[PDB]
Amino acid sequence: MKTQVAIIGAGPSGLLLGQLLHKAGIDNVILERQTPDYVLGRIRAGVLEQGMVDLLREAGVDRRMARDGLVHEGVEIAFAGQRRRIDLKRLSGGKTVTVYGQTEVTRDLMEAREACGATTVYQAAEVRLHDLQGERPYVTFERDGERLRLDCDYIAGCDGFHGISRQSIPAERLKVFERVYPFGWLGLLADTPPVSHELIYANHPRGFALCSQRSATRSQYYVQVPLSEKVEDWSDERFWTELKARLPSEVAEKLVTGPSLEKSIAPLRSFVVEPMQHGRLFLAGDAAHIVPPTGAKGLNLAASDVSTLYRLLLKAYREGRGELLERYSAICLRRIWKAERFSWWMTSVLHRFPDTDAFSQRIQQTELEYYLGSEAGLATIAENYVGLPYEEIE
Amino acid sequence: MKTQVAIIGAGPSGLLLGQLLHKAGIDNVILERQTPDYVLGRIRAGVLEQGMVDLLREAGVDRRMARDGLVHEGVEIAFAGQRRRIDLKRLSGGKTVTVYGQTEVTRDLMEAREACGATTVYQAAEVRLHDLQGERPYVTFERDGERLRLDCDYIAGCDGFHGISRQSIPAERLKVFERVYPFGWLGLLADTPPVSHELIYANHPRGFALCSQRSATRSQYYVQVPLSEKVEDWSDERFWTELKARLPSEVAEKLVTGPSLEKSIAPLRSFVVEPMQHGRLFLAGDAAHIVPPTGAKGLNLAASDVSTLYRLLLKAYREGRGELLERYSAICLRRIWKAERFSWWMTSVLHRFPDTDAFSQRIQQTELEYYLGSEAGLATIAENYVGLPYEEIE
Ligand SMILES: Cc1cc2nc3c(=O)[nH]c(=O)nc-3n(C[C@H](O)[C@H](O)[C@H](O)COP(=O)(O)OP(=O)(O)OC[C@H]3O[C@@H](n4cnc5c(N)ncnc54)[C@H](O)[C@@H]3O)c2cc1C
Ligand SMILES: Cc1cc2nc3c(=O)[nH]c(=O)nc-3n(C[C@H](O)[C@H](O)[C@H](O)COP(=O)(O)OP(=O)(O)OC[C@H]3O[C@@H](n4cnc5c(N)ncnc54)[C@H](O)[C@@H]3O)c2cc1C
Ligand SMILES: O=S([O-])[O-]
Ligand SMILES: O=S([O-])[O-]
């Protein structure tokens, strides 16, 4: 096979990059290790930044989102028995966020790519990258019992955290930054109407809780739990009782509960690699970084990494400004670090950390009080939550 | 589940460690991501050092090897149209090597573990390590549609180069050393009688070639080829013709050729991580290092890593000398580096490297001439080939 941009991974990052390149007339091929149904079987949430919403529209894959997505003009943080609303729209000047799951976005992108006949090779086993520092890099993989070669000009590693792309870069060139939080999130998805039209992030002595939604009849809730917790020890009844205990009475009081459609515990961690490229290989999305779910920035960083790569690739192909690609990592990292910082801040002020002393507890309560009670403070939250402005490049 | 030593990986390293611990009465459980047939489907060669042969006997899994294995008292290196024999037995004082494939060794270990009822969980998906720096580390994984927890005292990461164990150690604690050679090995396995009763490593202007064997009616041959070569462009006829062109006439002349049972190109690379442990987790085999096939040290290092870990675990459990486990990496690395060095030397003197000048070519020919023409030189080769003596520990 032969293309211009080889793409490893058919998750959100790879599909979005591929659809953007497709519309731009830049040849591209996506190689995915799993099957279509396997990828779609991954149930993942999503709170889309304005930048991502705009990118999906630019990619021509927004019809479903415009119909099934939930546009939120604000978000609330609860603590000390009170609900504090952050007016994202007002504070940002018009920006909002859209609650539409990664799973749905992935589904939409796959239907769009399948419809236009773009190239996607599923069940591409043993993917391997070659001659990355040359002008003719290529990829090899096995399919239907045969080895194939894919020649290209560039390679976009969009293969996630456990992909092969990040592992294909000499360890000497990379620097890893990481942190694991001392707790996980026990989530419960149910066919019940949400308790609020907007999300509710709750800080409570017993621990963090979050009220989210999927539709008028489907809701998603979470409560923080220690690392060693087993989902088996958490019946729906126990979850509902603990969730209510961490929410203001007025909220817990009007909460509609019911059987769970799915329950699971997920850890919270951060990870960033520098740089995010090597020769003709460029990493994007989870292949380069991880963030905790608190700020819902994972899916959004995948989008911003792709946007940047796409725009630089355009400059290379249409302006012969290929040297600009050298700036890919520096640009993405500035945004990734700010997202990691905001995600870290949100995690720090909303959760109960083990072995915390009285002073720390008071500092945390004061952080919430100050930020939610100041216009400047509220602004820092709002501008970060809807997503900081994309860097124009150059 | 609950055991004393949790083992990740049911390849040679994990199975051997597990069988050794089984006989010692130390509880152990092996978690393997793939199925039994998948593991056995990996066709891998093997030239066993005396130390490994002794270890398999100690493990009580040597009957098949004693019957089907080929004991070699010497090995030959050909160059400049002449065959030079290295009398391993004489030079080492009695040590030899046994040609018996990794695949056969793995098969033997699996039959032995299955027979004694030791615990092995195949298709163990999403393996994850936990609380490595505590006194109660544990592992989690999914099976038959359910999440399970395995408590233990120690964890042996025997999950290979692309395993999760090495990736479970903070990047800040690790230092990676690596090298990729500018060529690969095109191998051809056939049901033909070998051209020699001992191996023949050949250095020739056109490139490296190797004559090996599996039995009186089965042979394995290799010729070096550039990185970008496709096995598809190499018919059996072309392989046989190139192989002969790289061997002394007397050898090429008596070579029996025939249809290949299997053909493939494999790269040559080296990789070492320091340290090889973190808390209660200890890496062994490919999970910690890779060596080129030239010295056939890959399988042997897996064995020596296991031997060391096993002996240290014994000291911990039977002598309460658990502090000795702290020395695991230092001990293994001394042997790993010497094996990497010898493997590197063998690779350097036997292959044709791209863009080599006249001086390099002459230095290489002189290396062979000196080492094969000196008793001290021959000794350095012999002692390394049969395997240096295992470090006694402490
Ligand atoms: C339990 C959990 C909950 C999360 N919740 C949130 C949330 O609430 N909000 C949010 O924004 N983010 C959340 N995230 C993060 C978010 O899902 C990711 O940031 C997003 O999946 C990144 O997309 P990606 O395409 O970069 O990577 P992925 O979605 O991982 O896609 C990568 C693709 O590459 C393929 N691949 C891997 N290796 C290879 C290979 N060798 N060859 C070929 N293909 C390969 C994979 O099969 C996969 O399809 C969560 C993550 C987890 C684990
Ligand atoms: C093409 C090729 C040719 C080679 N030729 C030679 C040769 O001629 N001579 C020589 O000595 N060596 C050779 N080697 C090297 C040799 O095969 C290895 O050194 C040996 O396989 C190492 O054994 P191991 O048990 O440490 O790892 P492996 O054999 O890789 O076994 C690791 C096991 O862990 C499992 N695993 C991986 N990830 C997970 C996870 N997340 N959870 C659970 N289980 C997991 C794997 O499925 C596997 O079964 C060759 C290698 C290759 C690739
Ligand atoms: O199921 S598929 O398209 O390989
Ligand atoms: O095929 S098995 O034993 O999981």
Coordinates of N, CA, C and O in Angstrom, one line a residue, chain A residues 128 138 147 149 162 164 167 170-172 176-178 227-230, chain B residues 128 138 147 149 162 164 167 170-172 176-178 227-230:
Chain A
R128 N 4.4 -2.2 12.9 CA 5.7 -1.8 13.1 C 6.1 -0.6 12.3 O 5.8 -0.5 11.1
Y138 N 8.0 4.0 6.5 CA 7.0 3.0 6.1 C 6.5 2.2 7.3 O 7.2 2.1 8.3
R147 N 1.8 -10.4 5.4 CA 2.5 -9.2 5.8 C 2.4 -8.1 4.7 O 2.6 -8.4 3.5
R149 N 3.1 -3.8 3.5 CA 3.9 -2.6 3.8 C 3.1 -1.4 3.3 O 2.5 -1.4 2.2
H162 N -1.4 2.4 25.3 CA -0.6 1.2 25.1 C -0.3 0.8 23.7 O -0.2 -0.3 23.3
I164 N 1.9 1.2 20.0 CA 3.3 0.8 19.6 C 4.1 2.1 19.2 O 5.3 2.1 19.3
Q167 N 6.3 3.7 21.8 CA 7.4 2.7 22.1 C 8.4 2.6 20.9 O 9.4 1.9 21.0
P170 N 13.2 6.1 20.3 CA 14.4 5.8 21.2 C 14.1 6.4 22.6 O 13.9 7.6 22.7
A171 N 14.2 5.5 23.6 CA 14.0 6.0 25.0 C 14.9 7.2 25.4 O 14.5 7.9 26.3
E172 N 16.0 7.3 24.7 CA 16.9 8.4 25.0 C 16.4 9.8 24.7 O 16.8 10.8 25.3
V176 N 9.5 11.3 30.5 CA 8.2 11.0 31.0 C 7.8 11.7 32.3 O 8.6 11.8 33.2
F177 N 6.6 12.3 32.3 CA 6.1 13.0 33.5 C 4.9 12.2 33.9 O 4.0 12.0 33.0
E178 N 4.7 11.8 35.1 CA 3.6 11.0 35.5 C 3.2 11.2 37.0 O 4.0 11.5 37.8
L227 N -8.3 2.9 46.1 CA -7.7 2.1 45.1 C -8.0 0.6 45.1 O -8.3 0.0 44.1
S228 N -8.0 0.0 46.3 CA -8.3 -1.4 46.5 C -9.8 -1.9 46.4 O -10.0 -3.0 46.5
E229 N -10.7 -0.9 46.2 CA -12.1 -1.3 46.1 C -12.4 -2.2 45.0 O -11.9 -2.2 43.9
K230 N -13.4 -3.1 45.3 CA -13.9 -4.1 44.3 C -15.3 -3.7 43.9 O -16.2 -3.5 44.8
Chain B
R128 N -2.9 -6.1 35.6 CA -2.5 -4.9 36.2 C -1.8 -5.1 37.6 O -2.3 -6.0 38.3
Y138 N -0.6 -6.8 44.9 CA -1.6 -7.7 44.3 C -1.7 -7.4 42.8 O -1.3 -6.4 42.3
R147 N -13.7 -9.9 36.7 CA -12.4 -9.3 37.3 C -12.0 -10.1 38.5 O -12.8 -10.4 39.4
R149 N -8.7 -10.9 41.6 CA -7.6 -10.3 42.3 C -6.7 -11.4 42.8 O -7.1 -12.4 43.4
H162 N 7.0 -6.9 25.2 CA 5.9 -6.0 25.2 C 4.9 -6.3 26.3 O 3.7 -6.1 26.2
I164 N 3.4 -5.9 30.4 CA 2.9 -4.8 31.1 C 3.8 -4.5 32.4 O 3.8 -3.4 32.9
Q167 N 6.4 -1.8 32.1 CA 5.6 -0.6 31.9 C 4.9 -0.1 33.2 O 4.4 1.0 33.3
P170 N 7.7 3.2 37.5 CA 7.8 4.6 37.2 C 9.0 4.9 36.2 O 10.1 4.5 36.5
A171 N 8.7 5.6 35.1 CA 9.7 5.9 34.1 C 10.9 6.6 34.7 O 12.0 6.5 34.2
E172 N 10.7 7.3 35.8 CA 11.8 8.0 36.5 C 12.9 7.1 37.1 O 14.1 7.5 37.2
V176 N 17.1 3.2 30.0 CA 17.1 2.3 28.9 C 18.3 2.4 28.0 O 18.8 3.5 27.6
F177 N 18.9 1.2 27.6 CA 20.0 1.1 26.8 C 19.6 0.3 25.6 O 19.0 -0.8 25.7
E178 N 19.8 0.8 24.4 CA 19.3 0.1 23.2 C 20.1 0.3 21.9 O 20.8 1.4 21.8
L227 N 17.4 -4.3 6.0 CA 16.1 -4.0 6.7 C 14.8 -4.0 5.9 O 13.8 -4.5 6.4
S228 N 14.9 -3.4 4.8 CA 13.7 -3.3 3.9 C 13.3 -4.5 3.1 O 12.3 -4.5 2.3
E229 N 14.1 -5.6 3.2 CA 13.7 -6.8 2.4 C 12.4 -7.4 2.8 O 11.9 -7.4 3.9
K230 N 11.7 -8.0 1.8 CA 10.4 -8.6 1.9 C 10.7 -10.1 1.7 O 11.3 -10.5 0.7

